[PDB]
RNA sequence: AUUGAAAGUUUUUUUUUUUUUUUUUUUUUUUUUUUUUUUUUUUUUUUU
């Protein structure tokens, strides 16, 4: 199921507390934060919360994290290209005994590109088989505040981010039906401008064996709980600081490093354990190209 | 129930002082109140 967020306002994101300041880190909005906001709205409306809810991280509309096979033609530019139906043209021979070092040959032409896995990329145009793309840059501001009882005693600062329409995939539930606007950010009761959630057409994506684009920061296994095994993993390491309930005591702030978002992993088998989509991770999917947003 | 939270960018400061729209500039120069008109006509210093 697809959702739409007509944000068009200044909101915050992952903060890096420094002394007493706060700084923007992720140019996008992480699934955990969204899920927390959407569940807080449910709690406000009713209070009965459910942990079976999963929502993909939202990204600016018509944008997507970058993967390895979507590099930038310039070593310092922001213009990205890739082949139509690349993953079908890629993969495939993964069934065959084809050397991976030969598989990841990006020298389609002279002056071969350099990729930046996990960056916000905006679709641009057709341009025959090689689709035009552009890196996404957002607007940020600084909001500093004073502390009084008439007379200053301390100081604080914040960094807000400007976003256009936002899109994300969630779980089919009445929660989104009964929730319309969600306070999002570090300061939920101070600093929000405008927020809303729009339901749109249902989305049916298939998760099965084969090369899959890990939208969320996937993790192969945790605490020995094996989720899936991958032939070859292409991406980057990430650090996860989120929330998950294990029913009984405790169940907050579990820190476990993971794969960076947009990493390419060739998984050939899964497991039937407690899926980590509600924990905001493991939102892989099979796509023909980045045009899967359509 | 967002990793997560709660702080007014606030107090405080007069756009104020110095400077006269001032000096010089005669409402005067010229023009005869003259010009035609007889203080005139009528009347016995006088009678019974």
From TrEMBL:
Domain of life, source organism: Archaea
Residue span(s) of domain CRISPR type III-associated protein: 27-191
Keyword set, alphabetical order: Antiviral defense
A GO BP annotation: defense response to virus
Protein's name according to its UniProt entry: CRISPR-associated protein Cas5 (Type III-D)
Organism: Saccharolobus solfataricus
Lineage: Archaea, Thermoproteota, Thermoprotei, Sulfolobales, Sulfolobaceae
